[PDB]
Amino acid sequence: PRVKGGTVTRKRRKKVLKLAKGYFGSKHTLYKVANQQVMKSGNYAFRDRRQKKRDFRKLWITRINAAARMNGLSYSRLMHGLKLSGIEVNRKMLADLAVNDLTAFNQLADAAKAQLN
Amino acid sequence: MKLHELKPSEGSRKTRNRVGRGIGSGNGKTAGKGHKGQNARSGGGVRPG
Amino acid sequence: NRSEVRGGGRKPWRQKGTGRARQGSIRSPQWRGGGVVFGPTPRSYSYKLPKKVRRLAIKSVLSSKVIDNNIIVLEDLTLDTAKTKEMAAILKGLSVEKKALIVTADANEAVALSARNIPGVTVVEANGINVLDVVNHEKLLITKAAVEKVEEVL
Amino acid sequence: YAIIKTGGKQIKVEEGQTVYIEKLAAEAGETVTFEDVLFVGGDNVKVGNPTVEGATVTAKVEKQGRAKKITVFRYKPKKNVHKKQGHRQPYTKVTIEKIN
Amino acid sequence: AVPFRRTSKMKKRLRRTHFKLNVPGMTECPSCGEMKLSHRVCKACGSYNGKDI
Amino acid sequence: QAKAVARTVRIAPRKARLVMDLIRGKQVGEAVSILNLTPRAASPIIEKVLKSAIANAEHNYEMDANNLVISQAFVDEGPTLKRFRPRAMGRASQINKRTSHITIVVSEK
Amino acid sequence: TPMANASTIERKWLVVDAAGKTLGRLSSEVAAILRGKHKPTYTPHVDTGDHVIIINAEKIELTGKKLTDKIYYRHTQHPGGLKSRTALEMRTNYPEKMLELAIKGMLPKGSLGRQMFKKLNVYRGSEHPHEAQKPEVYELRG
RNA sequence: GACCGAUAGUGAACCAGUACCGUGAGGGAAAGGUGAAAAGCACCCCGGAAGGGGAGUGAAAGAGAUCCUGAAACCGUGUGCCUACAAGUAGUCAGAGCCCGUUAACGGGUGAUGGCGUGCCUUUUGUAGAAUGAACCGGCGAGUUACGAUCUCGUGCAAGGUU
RNA sequence: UAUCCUUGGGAGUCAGACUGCGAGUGAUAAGAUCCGUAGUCGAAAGGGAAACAGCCCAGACCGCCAGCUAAGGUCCCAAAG
RNA sequence: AACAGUGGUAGGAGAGCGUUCUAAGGGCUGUGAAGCCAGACCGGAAGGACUGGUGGAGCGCUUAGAAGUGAGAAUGCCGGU
């Protein structure tokens, strides 16, 4: 018996193309050039899933540092005082406070500032 | 037995190893012949001794 | 094959100078018309087992038929005619609403002329028994004569 | 508003709020108490020494699901390597009550 | 002396922007109404500047 | 509304595209003036099909010819014809005697 | 899931004198605030900074022999179109631009960097045309 | 017929060893499908015609003579969002605004702006590679079969197994 | 601390590169060549070394908007004195 | 359950997905098959469903079996653009 293979190839390639929407022209219109971007998008995505953890950390830290500098402190000195106290909350929480409830941030910073002395 | 409940004795049957049918198989692009050489060619080899 | 296919022969274009690819014939597998690489070729899928095994097989399936009680013994099949109405009436009386196999010893031609126009029914002598017919026909009818024959040759 | 530590992570919470967290042993209508609690917030304040005593946080489940899919695809460019792999991270949907 | 690359649809269209036709400088035929080129003769009126040929 | 089509006419489509990109979305009378006065090969064809359209409207729909507008108007590349020019040195060059399907749709205000 | 600002901004206007200051150590703060790192509501992609005014740019200071030996090179896109200007004559003729150069250099690059540069407004002397914005003074931490 | 089903299968499902190429021997194609049935479009209009729009036939005319379906490349029309101080293998992650509203779930389309990021294959000590190959889309296209040997697994029988 | 030996089936490989150390040839020149030895690459992504196969740190099932560290760093580009 | 582990070229081993055909058994289909187009569905992957549209007559499911069994590249062949 003989086997053509008419539907499978089309179906698979179309699946890829539906994944490749929004890409610039030929990279959504054509199979193979799109494939080699989709794949590349997969590696980029893996990478970025792990860069998020690295980026938001920075952002939180900058926010905390600004708030501590207006409170009269540095980030490093602050977090040292906090770990020395037991206030191991985390940086995301601290940032959310420093934006929304800055009085609580001040409470915590004053605790650490006191326990640095 | 019945034709619509057939099954073999385990270990009697196996699937054959096809090659040149992708890399997920682990036998793509070379069929396990490795890279270039007299053993990698069509009719490629030497007499046994 | 590329040899069996008609034509080919000449190098369609010189090896070099053209921008085109090296090609040796218009009938190699790359081409539209083309010769097939390996493909099929006539052969026989037949093989033979040993005798002990095959007789064990038929014994086994008969044992299974007698187990699940899709077996019927029926002495003295006798038809004044060779008709199918009578046979179907018999099968109805025996509550045989499906495929079926029928066995004799010496080829009751009346029974063979009948019973063939029925789709699901087949007829055979004791010498002509298979495993496949047995399995496939879901239920078995035998004359005790044929029983003695099969059990004495087995 | 309170803070809690649940899944090796932390959450800021207000009462009556809906949250999605890591998987738990609940059964889709049960209740839960978070006790690894700290920073009761919102009012008269209480901060964890590491953790504030008692002051638990009750809640109840509404779903025990598995989130939207992602197809991590990984290929070393040459070398003929691929890994295609799906993932539905389980999760648990919760509604809060009674910060303490 | 040849295209190192194939030209994309986008640049093809960006080139073909200016490749277009302006309309004519059009006027009516005051004699029998229909339109006409400026400073030129109404083919149907057969008239120009209030004068028939 | 109303429609007219000129299917399988030997002319290149881009040229027709130009000529109707002029008039897309205009009153029929001024459009006819455009086509009468512009010096291109495709204007007679296009005014022909347009005139057929307005005729279809007036005859089969009675839609007040003067009160009409080109709702849409487009061209579709139809079946080419293949030819060959004997260039130098025994080489030939493929020639694409193009073909176009002109389509016009007319409505009221 | 924190906040990421957008059109929820209040850009104040700050003023800085430079009577005895080193432009580098000064600029490293003014650029930080032009970027908004002195705020809790910082985001990297929104320009949360704050407008800045600088006065008495001529009256900056330097260390060492920079006025004689520090050289601002600048090339056209013409051959041998290299040009050089010492920090001294830059200070005399136009200190606005040399401050702008330093700060531009230590700002981020891209549209956002340029747009936060656009908040800067440097002025020789002590004139400050931007009275209307009701600015305030910013002393330097350094 | 555990043979093909119009790039397959005879080279050839059709007026093919034809057309066509070659002085010549010789080489050597392409090209199937209306409908159950012509009932194949009376008649009206546009138009010089072609080709259309109506009407009518028909279950169907989006079936109308390349006449079942009819994809993709390619070509265009319209429009929701974005875009004319911006450099970026063209995406990814974060993300505002705007527009929608699903196989109803931490939904969808766009995406200002920020961050990270030198294509695929081959061959190489090593290639983003200024080394090779591919214009693109579609189809076809490469480790098989016979016989024999050997190893493993399985089954049957066993100092006897087998034709 | 668990990998070692035998028998049998199946392979691929026999163009290697740099770095550190010890040697040769060289001009104690070569990103040179040829040897030994250890590592890395090859066949290994990630962080730093601006970028940067072979250097420093360290080894990727997958996810998380959690945390502690290595190398290297903390005035701004760019997180941190 | 506990513990430990899960980078990977050549290459070895094992698990499977899918295509055509056949046998049997059980089914779908003019109240609309296959095929084609959409869709925000499911699965660890190959992949598989559901709904709607087109189309207008054949096709799945289960267990087994046999193969012209899966294409992104050959300055590949043919056709189209």
Swiss-Prot record, chain B:
Keywords: Ribonucleoprotein, Ribosomal protein, RNA-binding, rRNA-binding
Record GO cellular component, one term: cytosolic large ribosomal subunit
Composition-biased stretches (Basic and acidic residues): 1-13
Stretches the record annotates as Disordered: 1-49
GO biological process, one term: translation
MF-aspect GO terms: rRNA binding; structural constituent of ribosome
Gly residues bias (residue ranges): 21-31, 42-49
Family that this chain belongs to: Belongs to the universal ribosomal protein uL15 family.
Purpose: Binds to the 23S rRNA.
Subunit field text: Part of the 50S ribosomal subunit.
Protein name: Large ribosomal subunit protein uL15
Gene: rplO
Parent-protein residues present: 1 to 49 of 146
Curated annotation (Swiss-Prot), chain C:
GO cellular component annotations of the record: ribonucleoprotein complex; ribosome
Segments of skewed composition (Basic residues): 8-19
Protein's UniProt keywords contain rRNA-binding: yes
Keyword Lipid biosynthesis among record annotations: no
SS bonds (residue pairs): none
Described purpose of this protein according to its UniProt entry: One of the primary rRNA binding proteins, this protein initially binds near the 5'-end of the 23S rRNA. It is important during the early stages of 50S assembly. It makes multiple contacts with different domains of the 23S rRNA in the assembled 50S subunit and ribosome.
GO molecular function, one term: rRNA binding
Single GO biological process annotation from the record: translation
Subunit structure: Part of the 50S ribosomal subunit.
Ranges where the record places region Disordered: 1-33
Stated family: Belongs to the universal ribosomal protein uL4 family.
Name listed for the protein in its UniProt record: Large ribosomal subunit protein uL4
Alphabetic keyword roster: Ribonucleoprotein, Ribosomal protein, RNA-binding, rRNA-binding
The encoding gene: rplD
Curated annotation (Swiss-Prot), chain E:
Gene Ontology MF terms in the entry: structural constituent of ribosome
Signal sequence segment: none
InterPro entries, A to Z: Ribosomal_bL32 (IPR002677), Ribosomal_bL32_bact (IPR044957), Ribosomal_zn-bd (IPR011332)
The keyword Ribosomal protein belongs to this UniProt entry's keyword annotation: yes
GO BP, sorted A to Z: translation
Domain of life: Bacteria
Pfam family, one: Ribosomal_L32p
Listed GO CC annotations: large ribosomal subunit
Entry keyword set: Ribonucleoprotein, Ribosomal protein
The keyword Ribonucleoprotein appears for this protein: yes
NCBIfam families: rpmF_bact
Family: Belongs to the bacterial ribosomal protein bL32 family.
Quaternary organization: Part of the 50S ribosomal subunit.
Protein name, as recorded: Large ribosomal subunit protein bL32
From Swiss-Prot, chain G:
Homology family: Belongs to the universal ribosomal protein uL13 family.
Disulfide bond positions: none
Record's protein name: Large ribosomal subunit protein uL13
Keyword Disulfide bond: no
Membrane found in the keyword field: no
Gene Ontology terms: biological process: negative regulation of translation; translation
GO cellular component entries: cytosolic large ribosomal subunit; ribosome
Subunit annotation: Part of the 50S ribosomal subunit. Binds to Obg (AC P20964).
SUPFAM superfamilies: Ribosomal protein L13 (SSF52161)
InterPro entries linked: Ribosomal_uL13, Ribosomal_uL13_bac-type, Ribosomal_uL13_CS, Ribosomal_uL13_sf
Organism this protein belongs to: Bacillus subtilis (strain 168)
Keywords: Ribonucleoprotein, Ribosomal protein
Organism lineage string: Bacteria, Bacillati, Bacillota, Bacilli, Bacillales
UniProt xrefs under Gene3D superfamilies: Ribosomal protein L13 (3.90.1180.10)
Molecular function (Gene Ontology), one example: structural constituent of ribosome
HAMAP family according to UniProt: Ribosomal_uL13
Origin: domain of life: Bacteria
CDD domains: Ribosomal_L13
Function, as annotated: This protein is one of the early assembly proteins of the 50S ribosomal subunit, although it is not seen to bind rRNA by itself. It is important during the early stages of 50S assembly.
